[PDB]
Design a binder for this molecule. Structure first.
Ligand SMILES: *[C@@H]1O[C@H](CO)[C@@H](O[C@@H]2O[C@H](CO)[C@@H](O[C@@H]3O[C@H](CO[C@H]4O[C@H](CO)[C@@H](O)[C@H](O)[C@@H]4O)[C@@H](O)[C@H](O[C@H]4O[C@H](CO)[C@@H](O)[C@H](O)[C@@H]4O)[C@@H]3O)[C@H](O)[C@H]2NC(C)=O)[C@H](O)[C@H]1NC(C)=O
Ligand SMILES: *[C@@H]1O[C@H](CO)[C@@H](O[C@@H]2O[C@H](CO)[C@@H](O[C@@H]3O[C@H](CO[C@H]4O[C@H](CO)[C@@H](O)[C@H](O)[C@@H]4O)[C@@H](O)[C@H](O[C@H]4O[C@H](CO)[C@@H](O)[C@H](O)[C@@H]4O)[C@@H]3O)[C@H](O)[C@H]2NC(C)=O)[C@H](O)[C@H]1NC(C)=O
Ligand SMILES: *[C@@H]1O[C@H](CO)[C@@H](O[C@@H]2O[C@H](CO)[C@@H](O[C@@H]3O[C@H](CO[C@H]4O[C@H](CO)[C@@H](O)[C@H](O)[C@@H]4O)[C@@H](O)[C@H](O[C@H]4O[C@H](CO)[C@@H](O)[C@H](O)[C@@H]4O)[C@@H]3O)[C@H](O)[C@H]2NC(C)=O)[C@H](O)[C@H]1NC(C)=O
Ligand SMILES: CCCCCCCC/C=C/CCCCCCCC(=O)O[C@@H](COC(=O)CCCCCCCCCCCCCCC)COP(=O)([O-])OCC[N+](C)(C)C
Ligand SMILES: CC(=O)[C@H]1CC[C@H]2[C@@H]3CC[C@H]4C[C@H](O)CC[C@]4(C)[C@H]3CC[C@]12C
Ligand SMILES: CC(=O)[C@H]1CC[C@H]2[C@@H]3CC[C@H]4C[C@H](O)CC[C@]4(C)[C@H]3CC[C@]12C
Ligand SMILES: CCCCCCCCCCCC
Ligand SMILES: CCCCCCCCCCCC
Ligand SMILES: CCCCCCCCCCCC
Ligand SMILES: CCCCCCCCCCCC
Ligand SMILES: CCCCCCCCCCCC
Ligand SMILES: CCCCCCCCCCCC
Ligand SMILES: CCCCCCCCCCCC
Ligand SMILES: CCCCCCCCCCCC
Ligand SMILES: CCCCCCCCCCCC
Ligand SMILES: CCCCCCCC
Ligand SMILES: CCCCCCCC
Ligand SMILES: CCCCCCCC
Lengths: 333, 92, 76
């Protein structure tokens, strides 16, 4: 217990007459703050709310001469409640909508003093950050979601940011397993944003997310492809079977608009037309033209060659649809 | 009792068409389209419980095979109707 | 279930009608059963409501098979 008493005196001196209201080197050069993230997970990548949820171990490292000690040789990990008695950078995430520091069993923080004065300050944060998504090519789209770490009250004359370790500052990105997204790339930037109140340091952590299309074939494209193929059956029924062909016709048409309406409600009310809309609207024309094919057949007869319209349509419809798929898939893929 | 039984019964429904006379074109056609549409909504409905995983689950393969049977039952009737040389059915 | 039986008073040579009626009724029972079960938790056993909807499904489905039996005996 002799060393415990020695540590108590040292840790007591540091907080004695320690002005929490003043940053390191107050009235002097800016304090450089080093950050390194450990992405614990990415969840709830929602386009209805245009945001993603990010859980991370957010560490900040900075030098504070006031917290320099030399008697103890080891680095002191202190109870997290000491952080309330220490100056820490007032960093905030500009695009953060809703965030919290995990609370059980205690406040998920860390304070680790090093003899030279360095302070390692870690938090486990779950932040729902705003990511505005361009759904024009959805679901065959790549999204670029970012996190904008910035100092609120301290300008570049009072604080500086840097990725501690540079390109090796953020880890865990490879391990993150999103269900419907592949994290193709991530980048780290250091900016200087200017507001009316001054210029502030800015660290931007961008992930380029690529959407997995395998899910959407199961639920979106194949059901619309099969219904499109179903409507072609009417070309194989004799013209006089009006109830059969019309019932086949409207049912395919009505289901198709139902699928389109059903899907687009799950998404936000964006004005533009996505890629899924292009395919569903493109397949709506074939099924609708399939029904109009019978209406022309009925009109031409009741209003040999009637088979020809029914015979040529027997092949051109699967042909023109295939070329539509060639153009669509080649263009988007 | 939420996916498999409805999937199994709609497959049975599509096979009721095989026991109807080939001249009942509207009746056998509504059998095919109704089951195919029913099979479609069941496939869409089934995925709603679980996340949007890219791969296909064991439920998906069962739904896919049941889709093949109901769809093949309608293609079967279209083949049968192709060789129906007369419109009027048996009488007396 | 009650309207399922009106198929029995329809003429035997009304495949387009009775089948449309029988198919319409049996599919509706599935939608009602599926729609009802959504409101409840993902409970892995048959409840009293379930044993009734399944019971009614059997009758309506049998009514559909009643005509299919009638059609086969006549034409087949
Ligand atoms: C209190 O806390 C301090 C700070 O962490 C501890 O001291 C550091 O301990 C780390 C352990 O992770 C040591 O890290 C190693 O440093 C080696 C030398 O780095 C020098 O150069 C860098 C350049 O930026 C300086 O920042 C640094 O201060 C040193 O001057 C590196 O070579 C090591 O990386 C190597 O790892 C393996 C094995 O060597 C190789 O295979 C790799 O290829 C790579 O070359 C590693 O990074 C570091 O030496 C210590 N000083 C620091 C970080 O300043 C104290 O130990 C701790 N007190 C305790 C535990 O009582
Ligand atoms: C926004 O974010 C900030 C982050 O800074 C939050 O501010 C902190 O909130 C916590 C929680 O309220 C504050 O912690 C409080 O510290 C007080 C002072 O502690 C010193 O002084 C006492 C004697 O007065 C010493 O015993 C102690 O060792 C310290 O030296 C405590 O008195 C408070 O106690 C309260 O909570 C305890 C819990 O057990 C109760 O038992 C008490 O009766 C009392 O109610 C409390 O612990 C902290 O000081 C705040 N500032 C900082 C810089 O951390 C905000 O809460 C958050 N939200 C909002 C709306 O701003
Ligand atoms: C998601 O989308 C955002 C867009 O908002 C992307 O972020 C931008 O990325 C670009 C490119 O990485 C940034 O643009 C510039 O990158 C430079 C990297 O160095 C290259 O370019 C320089 C100059 O062209 C070459 O000399 C060098 O060899 C490299 O080829 C930075 O150095 C730039 O900063 C410098 O220039 C600017 C403009 O002149 C100055 O104002 C700065 O002071 C500095 O001197 C510049 O950053 C861009 O900054 C990023 N942020 C934006 C636009 O806000 C993400 O990359 C994207 N996501 C992914 C995963 O890519
Ligand atoms: C360029 C390449 C692009 C690629 C795309 C190209 C697409 C090409 C495909 C075009 C469609 C193929 C039909 C073309 C011929 C139509 C006319 C016809 O009836 O022909 C013949 C029958 O033909 C058959 O026997 C039917 C063959 C197709 C049915 C496939 C069944 C499998 C369904 C699986 C689907 C499952 C769903 C799929 C799941 C993913 C007989 O003709 P006829 O009427 O008796 O009269 C002619 C005789 N006369 C001259 C004496 C008058
Ligand atoms: C001559 C002929 O083949 C007939 C068969 C079916 C007919 C169409 C049905 C849908 C109609 C909607 C509106 O009433 C406007 C006219 C409209 C486009 C019609 C044009 C003439 C068609 C093609
Ligand atoms: C002989 C006869 O009247 C026919 C008319 C209707 C037929 C049933 C339709 C549903 C069928 C589903 C599966 O195909 C197994 C056989 C299956 C039960 C059939 C049994 C024989 C029946 C009763
Ligand atoms: C602004 C984009 C409008 C898209 C309209 C739908 C196009 C469908 C093409 C079908 C080709 C047969
Ligand atoms: C967005 C401006 C209107 C574009 C209309 C395009 C219509 C294309 C229809 C193709 C099928 C006939
Ligand atoms: C609006 C009706 C569309 C009819 C499509 C018929 C396509 C084949 C025509 C070939 C005539 C010999
Ligand atoms: C899709 C529009 C086609 C219009 C066909 C009109 C034909 C009128 C009678 C002359 C051809 C038999
Ligand atoms: C990358 C996924 C490709 C999906 C291609 C679907 C092809 C459907 C063609 C149907 C032609 C009858
Ligand atoms: C028979 C034609 C089927 C549609 C072709 C789909 C092409 C997909 C291309 C995938 C990227 C190379
Ligand atoms: C719901 C996606 C299922 C895809 C496979 C369906 C089977 C195609 C028809 C086969 C007829 C022989
Ligand atoms: C392409 C859409 C499905 C067509 C199924 C009907 C096939 C009938 C062929 C009969 C002549 C061999
Ligand atoms: C395990 C419970 C089985 C439920 C069976 C429902 C059908 C029984 C009633 C049939 C009436 C004809
Ligand atoms: C556990 C058995 C479920 C009932 C199977 C249905 C067969 C028609
Ligand atoms: C477990 C008993 C099931 C009986 C259902 C009636 C026959 C389809
Ligand atoms: C389920 C009905 C079986 C009896 C049909 C009549 C004998 C071919």
């Amino acid at each position: 217990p002799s060393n415990m008493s020695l540590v108590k005196e040292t840790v007591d001196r540091l907080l004695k007459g320690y002005d929490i209201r003043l940053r390191p080197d107050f009235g002097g050069p800016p304090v450089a703050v080093g950050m390194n993230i450990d992405i614990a997970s990415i969840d709830m990548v929602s386009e209805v709310n245009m945001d993603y949820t990010l859980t991370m171990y957010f560490q900040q490292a900075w030098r504070d001469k006031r917290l320099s000690y030399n008697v103890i040789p080891l680095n002191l990990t202190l109870d997290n409640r000491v952080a309330d008695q220490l100056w820490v950078p007032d960093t905030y995430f500009l695009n953060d909508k809703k965030s919290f520091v995990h609370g059980v069993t205690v406040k998920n923080r860390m304070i680790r003093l090093h003899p030279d004065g360095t302070v390692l300050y870690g938090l486990r944060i779950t932040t729902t950050a705003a990511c505005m998504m361009d759904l024009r090519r959805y679901p065959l789209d790549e999204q670029n979601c970012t996190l904008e770490i910035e100092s609120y009250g301290y300008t570049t004359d009072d604080i500086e940011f840097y990725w501690r370790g540079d390109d090796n500052a953020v880890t865990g990105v490879t391990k993150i397993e999103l269900p419907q997204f592949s994290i193709v790339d991530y980048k780290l930037i250091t900016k200087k944003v200017v507001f009316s109140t001054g210029s502030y340091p800015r660290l931007s952590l961008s992930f380029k997310l690529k959407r997995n299309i395998g899910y959407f074939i199961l639920q979106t494209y194949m059901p619309s492809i099969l219904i499109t193929i179903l409507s072609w059956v009417s070309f194989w029924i004799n013209y006089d079977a009006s109830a059969a062909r019309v019932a086949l016709g409207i049912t395919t048409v009505l289901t198709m608009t139902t699928i389109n309406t059903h899907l687009r409600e799950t998404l936000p009310k964006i004005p533009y037309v996505k890629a899924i809309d292009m395919y569903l609207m493109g397949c709506f024309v074939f099924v609708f033209m399939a029904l109009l094919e019978y209406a022309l057949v009925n009109y031409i007869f009741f209003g040999t060659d009637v088979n020809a319209i029914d015979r040529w349509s027997r092949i051109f419809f699967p042909v023109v649809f295939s070329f539509f798929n060639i153009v669509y898939w080649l263009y988007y893929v | 009792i939420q996916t498999y039984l409805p999937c199994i019964m709609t497959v049975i429904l599509s096979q009721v068409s095989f026991w109807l006379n080939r001249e009942s074109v509207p009746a056998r056609t509504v059998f095919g389209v109704t089951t195919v549409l029913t099979m479609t909504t069941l496939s869409i409905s089934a995925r709603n419980s679980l996340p949007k995983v890219a791969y296909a689950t064991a439920m998906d393969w069962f739904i896919a095979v049941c889709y093949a049977f109901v769809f093949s039952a309608l293609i079967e009737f279209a083949t049968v109707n192709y060789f129906t040389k007369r419109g009027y059915a048996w009488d007396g």
